[PDB]
């Protein structure tokens, strides 16, 4: 079999790795905003729970841990 179909993936992958290298700092800034919005979205969900369960405040002694951090 020829390798004409491997060579397409070969170039795709090569270009992608070079693209990530060129933009790894732009991509990092975008990824930090995403994990930040992700933690907010998580807290809303937990908040929504106890508000729907009638409770007016968070359970006594509860803190929402920052699960989306390094």
């Amino acid at each position: 079999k020829n390798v004409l179909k491997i060579r397409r993936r070969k170039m795709n992958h090569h270009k992608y790795r070079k693209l990530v290298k060129k933009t790894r700092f732009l991509r990092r800034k975008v990824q930090e905003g995403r994990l930040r919005r992700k933690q907010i979205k998580f807290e809303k969900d937990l908040r929504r729970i106890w508000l729907k369960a009638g409770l007016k405040e968070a359970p006594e002694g509860w803190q929402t841990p920052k699960i989306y951090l390094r």
């Binding site: 729970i49 369960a53 929402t64």
Partner: protein
């Protein structure tokens, strides 16, 4: 639960040999577990468990005897791994033996509950019922539920404080 087999006991092959009581003291220790491999000790341990539990001591192809024989291996693998923490091949042999025993124990339980109870007692095996859903407990989950349990406990302590309002 920690009963260690005596080390002087004779090999399973020379136990019945008649007249062995008249041999020299040296010959007794040449035919003992002191001068034998670790596998020779496992034959005696299996023999003791089999005579204790199995109704017919000579039946080796019975579901009971197999569980006994498999439990002695599980014991032998666990001790091996206590010294060799990175022996991944023997780590795999342990986890497969354990699943094969649960498989034997599930069958015995469903066929002969009488002897199933005898096995679980003699070998100190606690049969557990397999969990239904094998789900991964990642952080988001492990926190959601941890909160949802605390919320429920709080709502519990508001009916208590609302029946005291009927008063």
């Amino acid at each position: 639960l920690d009963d260690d087999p005596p080390p002087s006991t004779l090999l399973k092959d020379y136990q019945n040999v008649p007249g062995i009581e008249k041999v020299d003291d040296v010959v007794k220790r040449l035919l003992s577990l002191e001068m034998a491999n670790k596998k020779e000790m496992l034959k005696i341990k299996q023999e003791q468990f089999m005579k204790k539990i199995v109704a017919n001591p000579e039946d080796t192809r019975s579901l009971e005897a197999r569980i006994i024989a498999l439990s002695v291996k599980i014991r032998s693998y666990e001790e091996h791994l206590e010294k060799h923490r990175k022996d991944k091949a023997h780590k795999r042999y342990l986890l497969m033996s354990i699943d094969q025993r649960k498989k034997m124990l599930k069958n015995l339980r469903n066929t002969n509950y009488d002897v199933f109870e005898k096995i679980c007692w003699g070998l100190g095996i606690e049969y557990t019922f397999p969990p239904l859903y094998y789900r991964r407990a990642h952080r988001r989950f492990v926190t959601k539920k941890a909160l949802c349990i605390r919320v429920f406990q709080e709502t519990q302590k508001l009916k208590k404080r609302r029946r005291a309002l009927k008063a």
